[PDB]
mmCIF file of C-alpha atoms in Angstrom:
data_model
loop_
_atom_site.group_PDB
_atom_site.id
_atom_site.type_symbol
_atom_site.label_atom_id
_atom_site.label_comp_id
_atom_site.label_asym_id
_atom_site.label_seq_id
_atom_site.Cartn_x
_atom_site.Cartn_y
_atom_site.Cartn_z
ATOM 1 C CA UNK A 1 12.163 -31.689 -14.411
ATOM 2 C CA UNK A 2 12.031 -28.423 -12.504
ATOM 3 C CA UNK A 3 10.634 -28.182 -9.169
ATOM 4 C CA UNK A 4 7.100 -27.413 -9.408
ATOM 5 C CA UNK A 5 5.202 -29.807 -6.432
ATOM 6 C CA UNK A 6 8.328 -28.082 -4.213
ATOM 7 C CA UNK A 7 6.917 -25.096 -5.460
ATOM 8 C CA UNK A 8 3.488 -25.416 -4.740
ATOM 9 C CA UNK A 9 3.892 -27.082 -1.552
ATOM 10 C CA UNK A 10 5.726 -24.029 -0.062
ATOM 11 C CA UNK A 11 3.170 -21.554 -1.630
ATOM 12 C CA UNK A 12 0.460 -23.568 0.789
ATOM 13 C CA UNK A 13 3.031 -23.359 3.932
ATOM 14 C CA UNK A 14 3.654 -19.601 3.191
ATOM 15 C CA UNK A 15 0.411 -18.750 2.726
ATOM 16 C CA UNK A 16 -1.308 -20.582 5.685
ATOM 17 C CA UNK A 17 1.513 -19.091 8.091
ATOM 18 C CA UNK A 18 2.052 -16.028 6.973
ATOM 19 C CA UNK A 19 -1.919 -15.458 6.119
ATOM 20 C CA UNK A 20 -4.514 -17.625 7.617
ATOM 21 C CA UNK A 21 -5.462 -19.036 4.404
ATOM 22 C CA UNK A 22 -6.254 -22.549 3.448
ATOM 23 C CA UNK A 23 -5.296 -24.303 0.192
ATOM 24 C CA UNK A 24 -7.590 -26.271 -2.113
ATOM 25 C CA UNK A 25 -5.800 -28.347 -5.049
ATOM 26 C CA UNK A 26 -8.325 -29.267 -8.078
ATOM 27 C CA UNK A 27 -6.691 -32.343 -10.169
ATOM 28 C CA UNK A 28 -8.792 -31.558 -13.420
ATOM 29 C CA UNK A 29 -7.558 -34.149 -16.036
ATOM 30 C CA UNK A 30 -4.463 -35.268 -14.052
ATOM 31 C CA UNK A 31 -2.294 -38.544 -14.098
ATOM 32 C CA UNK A 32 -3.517 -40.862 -11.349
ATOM 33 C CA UNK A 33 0.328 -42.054 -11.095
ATOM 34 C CA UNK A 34 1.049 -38.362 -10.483
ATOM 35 C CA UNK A 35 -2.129 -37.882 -8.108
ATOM 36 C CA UNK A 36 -0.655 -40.615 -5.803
ATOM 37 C CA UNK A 37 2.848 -39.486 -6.290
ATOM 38 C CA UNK A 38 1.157 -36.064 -5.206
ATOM 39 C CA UNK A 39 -0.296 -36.847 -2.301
ATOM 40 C CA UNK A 40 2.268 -39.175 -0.749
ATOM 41 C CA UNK A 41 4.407 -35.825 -1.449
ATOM 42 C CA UNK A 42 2.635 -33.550 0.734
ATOM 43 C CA UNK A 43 1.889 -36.576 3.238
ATOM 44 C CA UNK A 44 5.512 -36.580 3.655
ATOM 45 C CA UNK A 45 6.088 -32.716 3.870
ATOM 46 C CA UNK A 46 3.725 -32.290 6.039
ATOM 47 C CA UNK A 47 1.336 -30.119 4.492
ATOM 48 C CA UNK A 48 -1.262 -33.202 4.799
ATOM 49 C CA UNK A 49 -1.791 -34.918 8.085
ATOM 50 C CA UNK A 50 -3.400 -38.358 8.469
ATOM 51 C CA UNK A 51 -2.993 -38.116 11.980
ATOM 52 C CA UNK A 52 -4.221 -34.705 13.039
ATOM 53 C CA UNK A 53 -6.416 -32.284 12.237
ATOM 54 C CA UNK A 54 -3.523 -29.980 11.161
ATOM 55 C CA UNK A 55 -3.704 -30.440 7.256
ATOM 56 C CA UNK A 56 -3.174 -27.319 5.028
ATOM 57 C CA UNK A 57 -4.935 -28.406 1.777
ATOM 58 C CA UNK A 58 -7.936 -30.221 0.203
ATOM 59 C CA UNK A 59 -7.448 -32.323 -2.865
ATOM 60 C CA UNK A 60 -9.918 -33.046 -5.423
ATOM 61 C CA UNK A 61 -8.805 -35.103 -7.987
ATOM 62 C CA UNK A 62 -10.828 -35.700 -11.375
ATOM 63 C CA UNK A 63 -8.585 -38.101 -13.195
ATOM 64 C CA UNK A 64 -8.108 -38.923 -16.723
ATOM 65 C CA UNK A 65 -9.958 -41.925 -16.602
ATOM 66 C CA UNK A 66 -12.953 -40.437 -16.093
ATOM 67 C CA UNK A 67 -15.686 -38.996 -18.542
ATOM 68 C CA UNK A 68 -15.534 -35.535 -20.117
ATOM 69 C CA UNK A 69 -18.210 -34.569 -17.260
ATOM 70 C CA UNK A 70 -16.240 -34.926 -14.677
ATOM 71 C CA UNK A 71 -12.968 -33.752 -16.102
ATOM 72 C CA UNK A 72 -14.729 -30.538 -16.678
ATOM 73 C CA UNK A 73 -16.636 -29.972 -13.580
ATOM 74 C CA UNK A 74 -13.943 -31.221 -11.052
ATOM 75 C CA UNK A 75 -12.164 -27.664 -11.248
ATOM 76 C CA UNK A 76 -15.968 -26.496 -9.701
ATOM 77 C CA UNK A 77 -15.690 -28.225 -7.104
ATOM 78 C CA UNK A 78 -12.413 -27.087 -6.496
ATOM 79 C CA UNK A 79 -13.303 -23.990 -6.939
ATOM 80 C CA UNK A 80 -16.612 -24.775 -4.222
ATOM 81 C CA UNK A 81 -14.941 -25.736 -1.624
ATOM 82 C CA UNK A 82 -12.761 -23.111 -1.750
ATOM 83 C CA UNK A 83 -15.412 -20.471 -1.960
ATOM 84 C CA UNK A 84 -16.197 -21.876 1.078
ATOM 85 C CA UNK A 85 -13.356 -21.130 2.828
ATOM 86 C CA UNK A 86 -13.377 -17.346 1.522
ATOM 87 C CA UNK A 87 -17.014 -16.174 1.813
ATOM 88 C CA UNK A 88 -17.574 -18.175 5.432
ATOM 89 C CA UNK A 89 -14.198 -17.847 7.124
ATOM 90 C CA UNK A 90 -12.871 -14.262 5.639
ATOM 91 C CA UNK A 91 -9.785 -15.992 4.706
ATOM 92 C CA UNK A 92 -7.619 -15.675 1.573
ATOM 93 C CA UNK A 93 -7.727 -19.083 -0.096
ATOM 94 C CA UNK A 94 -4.839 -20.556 -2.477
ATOM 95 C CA UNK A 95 -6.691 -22.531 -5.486
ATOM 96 C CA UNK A 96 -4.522 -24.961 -7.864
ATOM 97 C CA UNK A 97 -5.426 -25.949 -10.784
ATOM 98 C CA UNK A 98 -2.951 -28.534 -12.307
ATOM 99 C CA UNK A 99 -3.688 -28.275 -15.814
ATOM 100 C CA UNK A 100 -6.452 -25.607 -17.180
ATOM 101 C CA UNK A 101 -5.595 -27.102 -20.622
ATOM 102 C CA UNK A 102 -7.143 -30.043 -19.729
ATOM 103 C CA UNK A 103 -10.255 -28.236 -18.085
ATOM 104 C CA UNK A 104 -10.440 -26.345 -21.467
ATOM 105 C CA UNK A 105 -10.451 -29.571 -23.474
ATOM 106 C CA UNK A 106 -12.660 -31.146 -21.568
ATOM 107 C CA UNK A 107 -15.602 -28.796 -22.372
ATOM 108 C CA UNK A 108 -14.459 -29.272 -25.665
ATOM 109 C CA UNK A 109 -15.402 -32.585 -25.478
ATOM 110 C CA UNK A 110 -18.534 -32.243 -23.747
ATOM 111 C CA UNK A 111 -19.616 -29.878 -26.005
ATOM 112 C CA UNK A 112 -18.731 -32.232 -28.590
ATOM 113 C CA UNK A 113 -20.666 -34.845 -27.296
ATOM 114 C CA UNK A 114 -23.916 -32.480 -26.836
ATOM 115 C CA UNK A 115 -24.077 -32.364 -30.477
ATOM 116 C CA UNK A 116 -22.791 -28.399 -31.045
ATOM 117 C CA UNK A 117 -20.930 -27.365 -33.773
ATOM 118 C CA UNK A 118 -17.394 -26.505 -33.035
ATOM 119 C CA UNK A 119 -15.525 -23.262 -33.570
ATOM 120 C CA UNK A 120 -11.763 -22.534 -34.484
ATOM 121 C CA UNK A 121 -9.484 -25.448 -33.939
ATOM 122 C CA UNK A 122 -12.178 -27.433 -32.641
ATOM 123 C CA UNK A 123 -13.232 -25.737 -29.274
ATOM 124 C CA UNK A 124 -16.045 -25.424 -27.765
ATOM 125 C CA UNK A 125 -18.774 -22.067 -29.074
ATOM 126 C CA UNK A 126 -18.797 -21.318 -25.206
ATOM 127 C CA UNK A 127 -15.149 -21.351 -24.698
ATOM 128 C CA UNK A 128 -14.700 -17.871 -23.598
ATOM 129 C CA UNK A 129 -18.077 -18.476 -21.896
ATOM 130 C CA UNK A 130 -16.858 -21.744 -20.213
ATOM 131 C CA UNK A 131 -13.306 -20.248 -19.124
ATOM 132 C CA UNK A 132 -15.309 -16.969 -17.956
ATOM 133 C CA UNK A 133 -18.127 -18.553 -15.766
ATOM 134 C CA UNK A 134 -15.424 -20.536 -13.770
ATOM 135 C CA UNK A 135 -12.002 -17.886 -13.246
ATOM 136 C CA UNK A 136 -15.349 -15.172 -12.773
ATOM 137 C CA UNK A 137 -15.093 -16.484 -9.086
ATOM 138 C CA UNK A 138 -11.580 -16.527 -8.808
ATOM 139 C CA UNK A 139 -12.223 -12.866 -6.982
ATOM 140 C CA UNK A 140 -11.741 -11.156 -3.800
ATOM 141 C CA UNK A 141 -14.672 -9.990 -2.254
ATOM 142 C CA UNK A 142 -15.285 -8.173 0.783
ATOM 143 C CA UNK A 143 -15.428 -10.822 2.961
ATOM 144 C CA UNK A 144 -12.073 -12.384 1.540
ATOM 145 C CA UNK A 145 -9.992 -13.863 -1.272
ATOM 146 C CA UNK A 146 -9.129 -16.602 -3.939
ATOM 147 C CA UNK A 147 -5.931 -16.274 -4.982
ATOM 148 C CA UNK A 148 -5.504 -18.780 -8.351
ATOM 149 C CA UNK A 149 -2.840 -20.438 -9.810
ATOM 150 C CA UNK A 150 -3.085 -22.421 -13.024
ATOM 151 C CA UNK A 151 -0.845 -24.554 -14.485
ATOM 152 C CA UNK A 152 -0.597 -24.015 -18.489
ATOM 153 C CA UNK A 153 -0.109 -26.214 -21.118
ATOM 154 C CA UNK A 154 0.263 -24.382 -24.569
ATOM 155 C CA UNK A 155 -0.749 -27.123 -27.744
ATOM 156 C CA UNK A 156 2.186 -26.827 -30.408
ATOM 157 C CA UNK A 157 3.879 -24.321 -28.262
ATOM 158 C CA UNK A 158 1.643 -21.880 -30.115
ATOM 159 C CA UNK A 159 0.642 -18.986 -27.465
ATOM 160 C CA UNK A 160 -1.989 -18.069 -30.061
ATOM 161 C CA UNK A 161 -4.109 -21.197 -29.708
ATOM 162 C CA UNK B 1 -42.384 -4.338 17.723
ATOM 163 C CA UNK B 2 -38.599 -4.190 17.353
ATOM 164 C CA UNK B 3 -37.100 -2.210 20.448
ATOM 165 C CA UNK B 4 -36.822 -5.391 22.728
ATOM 166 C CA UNK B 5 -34.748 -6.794 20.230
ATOM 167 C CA UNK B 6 -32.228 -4.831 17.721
ATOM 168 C CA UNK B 7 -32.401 -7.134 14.620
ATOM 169 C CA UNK B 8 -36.181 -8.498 14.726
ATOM 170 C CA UNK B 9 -35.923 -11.822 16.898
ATOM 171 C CA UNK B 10 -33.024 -13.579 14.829
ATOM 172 C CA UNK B 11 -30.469 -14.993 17.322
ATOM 173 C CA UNK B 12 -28.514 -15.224 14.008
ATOM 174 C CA UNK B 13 -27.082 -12.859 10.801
ATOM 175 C CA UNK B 14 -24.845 -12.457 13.841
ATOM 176 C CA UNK B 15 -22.097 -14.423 13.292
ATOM 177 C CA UNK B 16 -20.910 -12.626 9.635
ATOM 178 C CA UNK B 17 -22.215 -9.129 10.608
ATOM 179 C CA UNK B 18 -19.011 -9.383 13.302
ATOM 180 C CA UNK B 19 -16.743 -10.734 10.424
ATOM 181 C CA UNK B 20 -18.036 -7.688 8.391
ATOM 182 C CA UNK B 21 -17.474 -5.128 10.844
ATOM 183 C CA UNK B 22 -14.153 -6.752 12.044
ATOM 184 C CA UNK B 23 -12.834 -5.863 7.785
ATOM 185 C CA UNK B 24 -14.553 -2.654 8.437
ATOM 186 C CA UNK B 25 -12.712 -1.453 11.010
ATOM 187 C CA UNK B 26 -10.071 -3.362 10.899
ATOM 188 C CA UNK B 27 -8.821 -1.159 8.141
ATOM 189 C CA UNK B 28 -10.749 2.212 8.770
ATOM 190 C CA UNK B 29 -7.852 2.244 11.109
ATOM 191 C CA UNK B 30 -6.150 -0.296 13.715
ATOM 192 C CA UNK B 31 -6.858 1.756 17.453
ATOM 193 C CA UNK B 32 -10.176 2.767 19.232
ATOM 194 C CA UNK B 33 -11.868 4.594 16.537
ATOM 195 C CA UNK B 34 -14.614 4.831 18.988
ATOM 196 C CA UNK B 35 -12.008 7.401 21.111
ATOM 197 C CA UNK B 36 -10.641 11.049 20.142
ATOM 198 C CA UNK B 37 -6.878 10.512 19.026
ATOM 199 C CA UNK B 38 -4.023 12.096 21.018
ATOM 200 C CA UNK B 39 -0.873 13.058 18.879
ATOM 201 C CA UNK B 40 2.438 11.765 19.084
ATOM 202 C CA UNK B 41 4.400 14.374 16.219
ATOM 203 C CA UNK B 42 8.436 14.265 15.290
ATOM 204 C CA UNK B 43 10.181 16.809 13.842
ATOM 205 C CA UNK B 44 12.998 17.039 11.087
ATOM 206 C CA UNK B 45 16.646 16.280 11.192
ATOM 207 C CA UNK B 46 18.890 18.301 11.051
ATOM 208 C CA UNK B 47 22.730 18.572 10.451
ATOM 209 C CA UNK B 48 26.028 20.155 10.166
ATOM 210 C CA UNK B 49 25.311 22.817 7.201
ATOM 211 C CA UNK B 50 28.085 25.322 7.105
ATOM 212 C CA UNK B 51 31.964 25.302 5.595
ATOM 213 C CA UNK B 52 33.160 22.320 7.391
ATOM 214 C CA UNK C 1 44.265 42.508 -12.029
ATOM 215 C CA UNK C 2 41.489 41.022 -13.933
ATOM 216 C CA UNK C 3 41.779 37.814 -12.123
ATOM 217 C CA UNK C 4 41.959 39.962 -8.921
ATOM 218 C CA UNK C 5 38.528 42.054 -9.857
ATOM 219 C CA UNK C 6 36.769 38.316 -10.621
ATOM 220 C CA UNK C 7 37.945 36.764 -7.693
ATOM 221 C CA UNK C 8 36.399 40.084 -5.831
ATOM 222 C CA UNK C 9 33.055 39.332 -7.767
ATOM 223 C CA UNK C 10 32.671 36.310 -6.975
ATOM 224 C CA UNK C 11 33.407 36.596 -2.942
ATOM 225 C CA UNK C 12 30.776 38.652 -3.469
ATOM 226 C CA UNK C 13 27.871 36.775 -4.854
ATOM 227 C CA UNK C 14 28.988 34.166 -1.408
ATOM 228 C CA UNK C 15 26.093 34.867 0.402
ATOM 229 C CA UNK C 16 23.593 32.357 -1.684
ATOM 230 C CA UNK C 17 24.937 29.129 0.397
ATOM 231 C CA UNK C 18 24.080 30.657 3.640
ATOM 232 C CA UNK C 19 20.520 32.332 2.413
ATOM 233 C CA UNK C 20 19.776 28.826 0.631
ATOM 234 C CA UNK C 21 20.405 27.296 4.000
ATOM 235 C CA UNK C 22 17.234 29.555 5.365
ATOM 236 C CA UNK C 23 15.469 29.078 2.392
ATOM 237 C CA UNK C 24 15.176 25.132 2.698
ATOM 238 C CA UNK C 25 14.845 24.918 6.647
ATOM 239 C CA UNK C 26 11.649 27.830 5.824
ATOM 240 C CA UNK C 27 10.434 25.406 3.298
ATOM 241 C CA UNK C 28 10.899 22.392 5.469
ATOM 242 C CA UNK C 29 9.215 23.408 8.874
ATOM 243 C CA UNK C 30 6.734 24.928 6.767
ATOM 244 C CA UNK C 31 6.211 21.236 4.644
ATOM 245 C CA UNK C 32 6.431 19.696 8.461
ATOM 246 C CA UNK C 33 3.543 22.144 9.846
ATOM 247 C CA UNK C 34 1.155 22.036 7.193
ATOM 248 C CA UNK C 35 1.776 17.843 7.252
ATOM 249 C CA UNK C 36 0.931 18.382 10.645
ATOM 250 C CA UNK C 37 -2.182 19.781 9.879
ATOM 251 C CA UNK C 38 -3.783 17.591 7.801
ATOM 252 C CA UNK C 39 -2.869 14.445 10.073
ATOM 253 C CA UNK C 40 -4.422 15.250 12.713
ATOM 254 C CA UNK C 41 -7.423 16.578 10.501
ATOM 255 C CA UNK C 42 -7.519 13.464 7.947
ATOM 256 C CA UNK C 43 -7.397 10.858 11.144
ATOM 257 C CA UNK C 44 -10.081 12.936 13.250
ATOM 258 C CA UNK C 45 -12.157 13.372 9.821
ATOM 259 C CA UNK C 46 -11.741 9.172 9.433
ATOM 260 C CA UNK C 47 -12.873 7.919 12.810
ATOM 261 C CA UNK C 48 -16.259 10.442 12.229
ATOM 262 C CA UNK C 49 -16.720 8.682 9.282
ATOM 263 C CA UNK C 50 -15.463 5.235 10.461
ATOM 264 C CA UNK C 51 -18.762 5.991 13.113
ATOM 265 C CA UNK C 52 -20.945 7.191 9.685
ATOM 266 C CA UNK C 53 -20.221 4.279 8.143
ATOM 267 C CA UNK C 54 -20.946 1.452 10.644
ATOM 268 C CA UNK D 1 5.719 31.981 4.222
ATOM 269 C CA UNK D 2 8.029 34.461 2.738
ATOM 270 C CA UNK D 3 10.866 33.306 1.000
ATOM 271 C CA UNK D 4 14.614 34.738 -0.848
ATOM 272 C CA UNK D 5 15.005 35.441 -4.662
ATOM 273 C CA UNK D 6 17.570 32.562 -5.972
ATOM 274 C CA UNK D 7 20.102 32.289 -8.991
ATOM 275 C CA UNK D 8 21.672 28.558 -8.900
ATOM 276 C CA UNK D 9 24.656 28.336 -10.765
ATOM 277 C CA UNK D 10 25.711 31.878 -8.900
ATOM 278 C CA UNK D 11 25.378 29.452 -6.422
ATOM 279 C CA UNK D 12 27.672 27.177 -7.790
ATOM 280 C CA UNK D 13 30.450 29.984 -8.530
ATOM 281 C CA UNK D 14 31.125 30.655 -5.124
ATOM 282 C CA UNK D 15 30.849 27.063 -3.747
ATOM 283 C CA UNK D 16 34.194 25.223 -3.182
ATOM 284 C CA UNK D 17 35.685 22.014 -4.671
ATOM 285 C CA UNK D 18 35.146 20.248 -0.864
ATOM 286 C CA UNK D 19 31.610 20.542 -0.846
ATOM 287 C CA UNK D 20 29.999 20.141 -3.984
ATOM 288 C CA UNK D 21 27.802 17.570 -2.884
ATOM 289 C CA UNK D 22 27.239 18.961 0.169
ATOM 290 C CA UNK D 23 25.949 21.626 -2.261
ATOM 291 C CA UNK D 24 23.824 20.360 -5.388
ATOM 292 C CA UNK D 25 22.200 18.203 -2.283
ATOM 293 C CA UNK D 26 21.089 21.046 -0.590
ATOM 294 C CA UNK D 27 19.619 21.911 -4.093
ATOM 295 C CA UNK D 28 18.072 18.979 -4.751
ATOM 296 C CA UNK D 29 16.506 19.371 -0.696
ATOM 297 C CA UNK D 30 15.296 22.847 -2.111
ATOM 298 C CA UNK D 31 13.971 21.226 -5.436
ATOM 299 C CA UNK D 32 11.480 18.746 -2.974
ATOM 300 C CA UNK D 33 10.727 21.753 -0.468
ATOM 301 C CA UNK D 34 9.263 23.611 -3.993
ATOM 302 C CA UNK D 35 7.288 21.060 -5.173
ATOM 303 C CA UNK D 36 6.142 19.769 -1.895
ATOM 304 C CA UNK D 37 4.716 23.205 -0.509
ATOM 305 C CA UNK D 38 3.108 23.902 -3.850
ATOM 306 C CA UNK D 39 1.137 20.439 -3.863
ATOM 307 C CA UNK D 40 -0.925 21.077 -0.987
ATOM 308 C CA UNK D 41 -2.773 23.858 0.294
ATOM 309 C CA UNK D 42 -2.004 26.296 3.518
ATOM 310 C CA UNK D 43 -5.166 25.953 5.335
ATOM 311 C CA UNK D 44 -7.195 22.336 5.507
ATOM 312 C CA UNK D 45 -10.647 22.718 4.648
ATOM 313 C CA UNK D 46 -12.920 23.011 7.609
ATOM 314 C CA UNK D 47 -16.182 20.575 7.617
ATOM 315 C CA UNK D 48 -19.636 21.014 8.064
ATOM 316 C CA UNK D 49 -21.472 20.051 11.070
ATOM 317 C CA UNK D 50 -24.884 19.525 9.475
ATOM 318 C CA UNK D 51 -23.910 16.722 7.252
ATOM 319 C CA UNK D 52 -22.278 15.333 10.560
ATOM 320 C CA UNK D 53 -25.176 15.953 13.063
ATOM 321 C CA UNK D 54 -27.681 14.979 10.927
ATOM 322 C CA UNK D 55 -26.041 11.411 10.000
ATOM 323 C CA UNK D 56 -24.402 10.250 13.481
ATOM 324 C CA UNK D 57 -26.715 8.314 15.838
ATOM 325 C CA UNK D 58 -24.327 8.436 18.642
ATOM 326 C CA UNK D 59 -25.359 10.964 21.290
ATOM 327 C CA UNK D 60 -23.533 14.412 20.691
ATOM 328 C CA UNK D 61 -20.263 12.564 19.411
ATOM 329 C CA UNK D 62 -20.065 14.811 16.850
ATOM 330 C CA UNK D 63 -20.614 18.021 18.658
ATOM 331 C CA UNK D 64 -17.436 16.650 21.151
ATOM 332 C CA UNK D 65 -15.493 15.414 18.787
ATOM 333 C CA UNK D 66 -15.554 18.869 16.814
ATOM 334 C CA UNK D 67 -15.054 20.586 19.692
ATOM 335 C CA UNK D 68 -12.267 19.049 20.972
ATOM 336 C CA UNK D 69 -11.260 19.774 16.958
ATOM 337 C CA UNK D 70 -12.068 23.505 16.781
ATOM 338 C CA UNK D 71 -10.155 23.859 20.775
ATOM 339 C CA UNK D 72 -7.011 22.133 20.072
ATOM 340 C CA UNK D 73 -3.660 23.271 19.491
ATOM 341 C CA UNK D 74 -1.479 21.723 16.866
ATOM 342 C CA UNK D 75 2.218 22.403 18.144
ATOM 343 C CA UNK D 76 3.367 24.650 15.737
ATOM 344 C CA UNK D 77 7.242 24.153 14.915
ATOM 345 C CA UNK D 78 10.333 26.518 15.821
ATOM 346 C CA UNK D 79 13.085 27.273 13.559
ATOM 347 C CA UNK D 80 16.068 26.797 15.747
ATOM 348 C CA UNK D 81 18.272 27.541 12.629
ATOM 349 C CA UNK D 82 18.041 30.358 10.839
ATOM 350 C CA UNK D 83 19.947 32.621 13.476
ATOM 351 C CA UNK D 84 23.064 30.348 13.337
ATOM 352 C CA UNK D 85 23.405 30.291 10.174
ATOM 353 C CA UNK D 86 22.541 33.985 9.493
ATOM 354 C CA UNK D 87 25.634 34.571 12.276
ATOM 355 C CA UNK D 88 27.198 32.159 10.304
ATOM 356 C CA UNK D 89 26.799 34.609 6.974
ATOM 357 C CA UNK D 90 27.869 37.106 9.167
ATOM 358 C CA UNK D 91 31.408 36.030 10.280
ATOM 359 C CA UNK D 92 32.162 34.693 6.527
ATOM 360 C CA UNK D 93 31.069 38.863 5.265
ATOM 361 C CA UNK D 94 33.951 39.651 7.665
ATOM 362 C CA UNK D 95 36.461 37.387 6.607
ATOM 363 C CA UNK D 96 35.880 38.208 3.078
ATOM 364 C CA UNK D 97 35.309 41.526 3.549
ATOM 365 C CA UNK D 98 39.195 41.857 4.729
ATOM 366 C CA UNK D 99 40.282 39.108 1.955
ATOM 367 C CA UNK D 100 38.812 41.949 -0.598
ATOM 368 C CA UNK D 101 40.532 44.873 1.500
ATOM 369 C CA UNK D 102 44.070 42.945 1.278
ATOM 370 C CA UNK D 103 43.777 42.180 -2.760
#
């Protein structure tokens, strides 16, 4: 209901004007009604440009139709070609993630699939692991920045989970 | 055999050393560092202190 | 009478505006010298080291 | 940097009802002048040469920057204000002085 594409489409304006930075959107789990319904979004407010070489953002997208593999490693390459950005152009990069739930439940289900035992709830052993290896390069270095934000699901509203 | 060129024949490790350097001083301080500083100073205000 | 002999006592502990007046412009050319100071020797002490480090 | 002995509510005794803010921010001014002066030191500590002519590349920067250090004058401020006010102190002694001699 609220605003939250408004949101993030102004964070990428703001932060390419007022820094120099480059946006990168990861799409880990997401919608592919929503993707489009993305993407025609920031077509339209100008933060994409499929006429110049003037666009703000790159989008990967790993959809929910797709196996636990990619759902899980989409928000890698995200968080790639954003590193790119950072550690080869010194600027401070603006990475979305549109649902870390879903990146966490997709290693749940790979991990499933490799055969491993799961631990409370259901998740993954290498949860913290998992999580840690991936927000790990979230940083800012000395030759720049990435500068993350997630959106949250919380299962049963439970903020213990 | 190094003194007819600085960084061992590379013609490259060029292009981030500047990037470096540009952080470095960049925010060491923002004038010619290279230079001795001359002084601009101000001094305090001041203002009507006794039984008005 | 008694109210005349306070009144007298206090006009005479008066002078403590006007020597607080010295004491805080004192205190606050001092503060503005010594800032002074270590401007000009922090900034000349960073661009040696500014060299030292590159 | 020699300073005056202070009570502070004698100072609020003989300080009228038209300038009490005038006053207790004057006190407050004194209460940052105390705590600023006794934060940092009088003198800056002087540096070492050695561990700056044995580290610089650069041809005698050091020695010229330094000098141009140990042969410069920092302006050093003036007070401007203590005599006005002290004449200040002066004229008020008189005027009290004869408000005592009448009562």
């Amino acid at each position: 209901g609220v605003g939250k594409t408004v949101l993030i489409m102004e964070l990428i304006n703001n932060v390419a004007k007022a820094h120099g930075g480059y946006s990168v959107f990861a799409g880990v789990g997401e919608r592919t009604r929503e993707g489009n319904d993305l993407y025609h979004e920031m077509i339209e407010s100008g933060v994409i440009n499929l006429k110049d070489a003037t666009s703000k953002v790159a989008l990967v997208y790993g959809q929910m139709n797709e196996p636990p593999g990619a759902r899980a490693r989409v928000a890698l390459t995200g968080l790639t070609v954003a590193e790119y950005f950072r550690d080869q152009e010194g600027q401070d990069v603006l990475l979305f993630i549109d649902n870390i739930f879903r990146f966490t439940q997709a290693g749940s289900e790979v991990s499933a699939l490799l055969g491993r035992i799961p631990s409370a709830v259901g998740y993954q052993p290498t949860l913290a692991t998992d999580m840690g290896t991936m927000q790990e390069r979230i940083t800012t270095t000395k030759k720049g920045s990435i500068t993350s934000v997630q959106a949250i699901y919380v299962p049963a509203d439970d903020l213990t989970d | 055999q190094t003194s007819g060129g600085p960084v061992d024949a590379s013609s490259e490790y060029q292009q981030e050393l500047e990037r470096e350097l540009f952080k470095l001083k960049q925010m060491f301080g923002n004038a010619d560092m290279n230079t001795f500083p001359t002084f601009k100073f101000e001094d305090p205000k001041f203002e009507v202190i006794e039984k008005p | 009478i008694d109210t005349e002999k306070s009144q007298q006592a206090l006009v005479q502990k008066r002078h403590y505006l006007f020597d607080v007046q010295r004491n805080n412009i004192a205190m606050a050319l001092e503060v503005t010298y010594r800032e002074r100071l270590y401007r000009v020797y922090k900034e000349v002490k960073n661009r040696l080291d500014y060299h030292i480090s590159v | 940097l020699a300073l005056k002995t202070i009570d502070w509510v004698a100072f609020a005794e003989i300080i009228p009802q038209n300038q009490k803010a005038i006053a207790s921010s004057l006190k407050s001014w004194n209460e940052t002048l105390t705590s600023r002066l006794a934060a940092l030191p009088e003198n800056p500590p002087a540096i070492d040469w050695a561990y700056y002519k044995a580290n610089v590349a650069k041809a005698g920067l050091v020695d010229d920057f330094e000098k141009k250090f140990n042969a410069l004058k920092v302006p050093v401020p003036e007070d401007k204000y203590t005599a006005q006010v002290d004449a200040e102190e002066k004229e008020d002694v008189k005027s009290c002085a004869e408000w005592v001699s009448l009562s």
